[PDB]
Amino acid sequence: PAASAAMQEALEGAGRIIDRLLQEDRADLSELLNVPVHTCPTISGVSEMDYPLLPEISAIRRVPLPPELIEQFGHMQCNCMMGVFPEISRAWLTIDSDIFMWNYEDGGDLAYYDGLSETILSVGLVKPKTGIFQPHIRFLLVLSTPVDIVILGLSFAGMQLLPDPLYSLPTDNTYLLSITSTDNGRIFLSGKDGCLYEVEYQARCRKINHSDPIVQIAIDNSRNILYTRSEKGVIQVYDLGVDGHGMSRVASVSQNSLVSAAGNIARTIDRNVFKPIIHISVIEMSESVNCHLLAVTHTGVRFYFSTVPFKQPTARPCMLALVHVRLPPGKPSKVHKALYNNGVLLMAASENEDNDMLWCINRDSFPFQKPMMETQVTTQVDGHSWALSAVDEQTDSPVIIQQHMIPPKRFVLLSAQGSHIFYKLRPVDQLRHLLVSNSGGDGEEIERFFKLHQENQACATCLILACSSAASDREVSSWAARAFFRYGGEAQLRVQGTEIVFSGKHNGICIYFCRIIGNIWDGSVAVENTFQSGNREVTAIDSSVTPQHLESVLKELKGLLEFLDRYSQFTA
Amino acid sequence: SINSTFYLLLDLITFFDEYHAGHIDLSFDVIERLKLVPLSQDSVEERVAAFRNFSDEIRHNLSEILLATMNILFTQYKRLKGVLRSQARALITFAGMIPYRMSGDTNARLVQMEVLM
Amino acid sequence: EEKLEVARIQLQIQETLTRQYSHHSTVGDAVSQLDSQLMDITKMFGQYADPFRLSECKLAIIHCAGHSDPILVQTLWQDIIDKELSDSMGNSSVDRMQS
Secondary structure, three states: OHHHHHHHHHHHHHHHHHHHHHHHHOOOHHHHHOOOOOOOOEEEOOOHHHOOOOOOOOOOEOOOOOHHHHHHHHHOOOOEEEEEEOOOOEEEEEEOOOEEEEEOOOOEEEEEEOOOOOOOOEEEEEOOOOOOOOOOEEEEEEEEOOOEEEEEEEEEOOEEEEEEEEEEEEOOOOOEEEEEEOOOOOEEEEEOOOOEEEEEEOOOEEEEEOOOOEEEEEEEOOOOEEEEEEOOOOEEEEEOOOOOOOOEEEEEEOHHHHHHHHHHHOOOOOHHHHOOEEEEEOOOOOOOOOOOEEEEEOOOOEEEEEOOOOOOOOOOOOOOEEEEEEOOOOOOOOEEEEEEEOOEEEEEEEOOOOEEEEEEEEOOOOOOOOOOOOEEEEEEEEOOOOEOOOOOOOOOOOHHHHOOOOOOEEEEEEEOOEEEEEEEOOHHHHHHHHHHHHOOOOOHHHHHHHHHOOOHHHHHHHHHHHOOOOHHHHHHHHHHHHHHHHHOOOOEEEEOOEEEEOOHHHHHHHHHHHHHOOHHHOOOOEEEEEEEEOOEEEEEEEEOOOHHHHHHHHHHHHHHHHHHHHOOHHHO | OHHHHHHHHHHHHHHHHHHHHOOHHHHHHHHHHHOOOOOOHHHHHHHHHHHOOOOHHHHHHHHHHHHHHHHHHHHHHHHHHOOHHHHHHHHHHHHHHOOOOOOHHHHHHHHHHHHHO | OHHHHHHHHHHHHHHHHHHHOOOOOOHHHHHHHHHHOOOOHHHHHHHHHHHHOOHHHHHHHHHHHOOOOHHHHHHHHHHHHHHHHHHHHHOOHHHHHHO
């Protein structure tokens, strides 16, 4: 009883800390960038604290462009273009009339296609519109030549491209500059005369015009808002309606209107640093319901732009109003290509004509800092950056709570010399290298990382390795727990009523546990599912939890029991 | 301990299987993750101290292990020709500090290939 | 072989100084010297550690050479002990035990 009652009291206080932390864990890019209202832009990127700053990127593994391509490069005298297709681990290199597509992972699967007589000018990949093609046709390759648009089916056994195009249509003597698509398989093309066109197909295909050559079409299939940009920095916003089959222009802003508003906001900057506008990019709602556009300037001015009034999540796009301007570190110059993903911004700059510098900034270091901080670094890369893509893998809490299950993240950069993969190391791999260099669980750098991450979270990230089981860490392990024992501090009674501050260890293990499972601390044990068994609806009560995830959760819990046990005697 | 040894054994079995197949990059990734052989100078000392606790069946293989690793990285500078340097350096330094007489012809191939780059 | 043995014992003295003796004035100079050239046994014995009471490195060398006069070993051990104990004076009794 008194035992069981104290146990209930425990589980309760535990869940109390757990809900406290999870609530904090839901806690926006808006409330990050300190922009109070949809109309009240602010700026960051000027004070050293914003960049108050331990390897952050993995060391680059190179990979040479497969020899066959360095061979064929002798025959391209008209033109050449190279793009990266992430979803299929592929690169596409068009010589004037022909396409070559290779396995960008290791240079295999060189497939060629020479069925075009005139110069291919733009290329697109499309996931086919549901049920329109038979099931072997995984994707559609759209090619754009000075005369026409050609649609070829692409099946996958091995890269299998159908030799006969699935469709042909006239480009109307209008050079197609960019090919793009939204999730449901709508095909958009950018006409060199700045007109946005749509290729509406069914099971049968037609071009249509819905609308300063527009050179980049960004589609956020998370809100069905199509954002487009002209060479003169014209930014046009079109709503596709809630159902996403619509097309209607809703807003537009000119590069000069931008620069003017800018010089109005940041009174001290030479206004030219605002222009021209090199990149637009959709900031998916998943990270921020508020912001719906990021913009990247040649001098790295980073602009945030919104389309609907703040805290109006159902509104399709209505305006194009800037909210906050991000000034760069220091300094970046000649930015000539870029890519953004999940609080990571990479930009390729022309130091020399054949050597590029890659700058990357990210907000990992202090996901809990008001205002936003970020760590950044630049690295050498051989070649003019022809394309810079990310590999798509399979609000969120921040890494500092989910590191106990999810990988450190991989990014891939493509250059004239080849591929360079790198990894954003979670705080885990940080603590790792900090340990492995000093080669022993003691080191002042350890005192530093400890003071940095607010001892409690430290102790947690310490256990994060202190129970790892694969072989490569057996030694590190014995060290790190030593560390957890040394730098976590000591329990003491804080006399204010007297409040107890459990040592970074206690709350740390608590947080570790909750981070292990957490959501089931309050969630349902069972949920009624309904299956349409023919002409009869069947109610079953199925587990709220699935097996495989439960197996993993167990395994980790077992681990926690193990460490808890091995330390059980040592705490008394 | 045992469980570890077992898992590592299956793993390295896969590793050498791939190696014999020649999907080199795979093997590279495998060893890389396996964090046994140092591959960048600063790791060396740490990895080396580990040997003074590594269980036997590993030790029995460590020779062919290092051999294949350096053969791979060699082929890497080969294709890049036809970091790698600093990695090779970490490997050779490991070989030196290692409190265990590797075989002779082992040391022979190691030194020769370390030169030929 | 005996050489690389020495070299280790040195590097141990070096990292030990760095970790423990950032506040010491003469730290940087000992550092530069020892990072310059291979030191003789008696050198490392008298100049670096004997000044700094680096009992760990002391036992390290004393084994590296093999003199063994009973009382010295015991005093050295007890020294390592009482030190490691005193340092944990702030940790919990249990933590002191585990350390």
